[PDB]
Design a protein around this ligand. Structure first.
Ligand SMILES: COCCOCC(=O)Nc1cccc(F)c1
Ligand SMILES: [Mg+2]
Lengths: 150, 151
């Protein structure tokens, strides 16, 4: 169906952008709103309400640019805003070598049903936060499986 | 001011802030503002954004060596319609010989539309505008803003 084709196109755009950033070790933080509304966090960023593309996702996260600091939040198959604030987790069970991007992802996942993707600037490793847990060192296939399951 | 007028002012402020930032850093840029002649054919050649304007997004689009930086951004009213768009190249002899493809594309679209295109030179940081087949170079910040307000 059209709804199904659109969801698959968005998954492909996300995974292509994540692969590019993982290869270049570009830090990234991408939260996908689900049933819990995240308007309060969307409002802290720069409004985009843009069509998803791998190109736009990559351009947003380039280091030392206006939009790269903070989270992209996606809602209703669009990029709602960039450079958004997310709350930092205080969980003592996050790997101690991880920094604020990962703590922000876990933090939003503690108070919403959202799915957040993180690319590490240190290693290019890809992780996902959901339900208060961080799933680390994902393969491309693992991330795709999580997006399709979501 | 009406909301339409306020939105137009917000969009002009976003554009001028972005152009000033890129000019200072010699970031090449090509930004076409659709007017009454529709530019759908050219919009459809690029990557669709249909995004709210911000200075931040305009700057992020044109950063060198990124997916969206080559080609034109085309704006429709208060939105960035698409990036990395094709525009036709002018053959006008009144384009300074040292100028490259962004300036020629800007003049080219200006010959077949009533659009206003802004160009930032990656060589000099100079700012120019193409309208109605003419290129006006080395604009001050004030001159650009006045041209946009008049547009
Ligand atoms: C040019 O292709 C680059 C692909 O990089 C893949 C890579 O190193 N890490 C990676 C990418 C996507 C998801 C994931 F869990 C991990
Ligand atoms: Mg002069």
């Amino acid at each position: 169906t059209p709804v199904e084709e659109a969801q698959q196109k968005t998954i492909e755009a996300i995974t292509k952008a994540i692969n590019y950033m993982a290869k270049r070790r570009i830090g990234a933080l991408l939260t996908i709103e689900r049933d819990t509304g995240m308007g309060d966090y969307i409002e802290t960023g720069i409004p985009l309400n843009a069509k998803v593309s791998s190109e736009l996702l990559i351009n947003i996260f380039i280091p030392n640019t206006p939009l790269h600091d903070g989270a992209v939040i996606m809602k209703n198959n669009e990029i709602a805003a960039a450079a958004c604030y997310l709350p930092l987790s205080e969980s003592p069970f996050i790997s101690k070598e991880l920094g604020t991007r990962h703590r922000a992802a876990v933090g939003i996942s503690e108070v919403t049903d959202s799915l957040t993707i993180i690319v590490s600037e240190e290693t290019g490793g890809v992780s996902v936060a959901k339900n208060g847990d961080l799933h680390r060192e994902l393969t491309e296939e693992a991330l795709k499986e999580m997006l399709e399951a979501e």
